Amino acid sequence: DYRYEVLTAEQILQHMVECIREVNEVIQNPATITRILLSHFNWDKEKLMERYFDGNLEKLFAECHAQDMPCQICYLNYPNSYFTGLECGHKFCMQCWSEYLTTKIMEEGMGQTISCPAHGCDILVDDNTVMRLITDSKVKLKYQHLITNSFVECNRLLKWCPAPDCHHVVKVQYPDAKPVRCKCGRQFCFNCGENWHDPVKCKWLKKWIKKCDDANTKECPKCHVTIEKDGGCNHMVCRNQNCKAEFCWVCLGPWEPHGSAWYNCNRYALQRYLFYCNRYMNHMQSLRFEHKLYAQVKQKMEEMQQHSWIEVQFLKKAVDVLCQCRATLMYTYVFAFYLKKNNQSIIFENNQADLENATEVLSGYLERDISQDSLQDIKQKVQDKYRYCESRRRVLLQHVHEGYEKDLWEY
Amino acid sequence: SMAASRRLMKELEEIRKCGMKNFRNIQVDEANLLTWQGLIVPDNPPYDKGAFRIEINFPAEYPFKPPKITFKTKIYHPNIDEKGQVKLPVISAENWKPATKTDQVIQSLIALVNDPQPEHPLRADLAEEYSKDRKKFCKNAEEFTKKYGEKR
Ligand SMILES: [Zn+2]
Ligand SMILES: [Zn+2]
Ligand SMILES: [Zn+2]
Ligand SMILES: [Zn+2]
Ligand SMILES: [Zn+2]
Ligand SMILES: [Zn+2]
């Protein structure tokens, strides 16, 4: 097994606040400054005490870092009751606070403290009065995330969920580069933090995200009518009267020599990168269109309900198989690009092609050929297809892993 | 987007009523109010032989996000690139305070015009010219100012 546990940003804050207030009884600083101190020493309570007396605190603290008037931010007048302030005596209406704080806790330029909104001054707003002045628990969560990020980075058994508005942490017994699952649903690699990437190792994915950091439409090979891609499937049938021929979108060669021993377009130094990156990026783009299939299938599963919810389950499963396979596929192109060609690589490439074809067939049935088919026939067809897609995917991963157990793979 | 216009309305009312000598010729689209224009008139050489067109652009989220000043007149200054963007520190997203007034923002732009800060520039080569050989730079910027300036 690989056991782990999910905690909320609420819980992971209580953890920190307790870790603060065990230092904070010794050093008697305010709760918010101790946090910034402890953050600076990477939550080593010792290398904090071996500086919080050793040196002059000034160098330490430097290393770490009119009443009946209108509001000076919005210019409207209110009763003095509504004007909150900080320790500087700068006061502002309780809404401008909420608007300032809120827009300050959105990404571009956030560190881990917010200062007073006055011109000039930079007296920090203490953690606890940020929570008190902002309202919506969506924003509040983000703040908690930001002040706790240091605490969670400095701890090697906690990682954040990568999902953008989920602020939960997975907690483990050891780090391993196995897959963990958030409880918003998101499944990620605990070691590297990216999305789960079964065949490729985390190192080679890091290298492939930096190198990849720096065509939406294309023309029919036969009739040259501009085809925008609408759906993730790559078995392209040409929407025309003149030419109703079929062609693989990536290589633009023909279908159906695809899915045979003879023709393989998945097998191939910047000319090379463009080949493998094209297929990765394509499969990624495809995966997005793949997600929007929970709509289209429930329209057919709803139409099958009226002619119920039991059947609707198999089509969801089908789309969930398809998404997982595409995802693997995506990443097999990362793994291959870095691969020194050897005795096992040929067998891998065949499995990659088997999975690629077995995906396109499932992907293209749910996108086109299901509606050109009767109702009693599609339960069997779809099931037989995703069960096969799943085997080819499982065969592929089984193969690389054998190789990894014996260092078969070179780079 | 509306509350911005409401604030700029009051700001713009206080400007045209008290005046800005160094910042003249203020044109704002009254429908919008989020996009002013005007002509800076510096007092120090190497720019006192001309004036410069700036366009201010207030976001919807003003005053909780800062505006963005871009010069339309070309200028020879270490802190303003060729496309017109100015690196004014008080306006950057890190330092911006929603209680900072537009009048202060602009006075601060004329600080920068009248005393170029080569320490954190946009034109790094112009910054070298300014420090390492003042007299020559002041002359280069003067003739650029005379060639591309505006009548006072
Ligand atoms: Zn206010
Ligand atoms: Zn203040
Ligand atoms: Zn999550
Ligand atoms: Zn990983
Ligand atoms: Zn065609
Ligand atoms: Zn192909």
Numbering used by the authors:
A (entry chain A): 98 to 162, 181 to 329, 339 to 392, 410 to 448, 451 to 554
B (entry chain C): 0 to 151
Tell me what the authors wrote about this structure, in their words.
RING-between-RING (RBR) E3s contain RING1 domains that are structurally similar yet mechanistically distinct from canonical RING domains. Both types of E3 bind E2∼ubiquitin (E2∼Ub) via their RINGs but canonical RING E3s promote closed E2∼Ub conformations required for direct Ub transfer from the E2 to substrate, while RBR RING1s promote open E2∼Ub to favor Ub transfer to the E3 active site. In contrast, substrate ubiquitination by HECT (Homologous to E6AP C Terminus)-type E3s and by RING-between-RING (RBR) E3s is performed in two steps.
The asymmetric unit contains two copies of HHARI each bound to UbcH7∼Ub. Weak density was observed for the two Ub moieties, with only one placed into the final model. Second, UbcH7∼Ub is in an open conformation consistent with earlier conclusions that HHARI RING1 promotes open states of UbcH7∼Ub (Dove et al., 2016). Though weak, the electron density observed for the Ub moiety does not contact its cognate HHARI partner. Consistent with this observation, HHARI is still in an auto-inhibited conformation in the structure of the HHARI/UbcH7∼Ub complex reported here: the active site in RING2 is far from the UbcH7 active site and occluded by the Ariadne domain. The structure reveals an extensive hydrogen-bond network emanating from Lys96 to three RING1 Zn2+-loop II residues (Ser230, Cys231, and Asp237). Previous NMR mapping revealed that the HHARI RING1-binding surface extends onto the crossover helix of UbcH7 and includes Gln103 (Dove et al., 2016). Consistent with those observations, the tip of Zn2+-loop II reaches past UbcH7's loop 7 to contact Gln103 on the E2 crossover helix. Analysis of the HHARI/UbcH7∼Ub crystal structure revealed that Ub from the UbcH7∼Ub bound to HHARI contacts the UBA-L domain of an HHARI molecule in a neighboring symmetry unit (denoted with a prime).
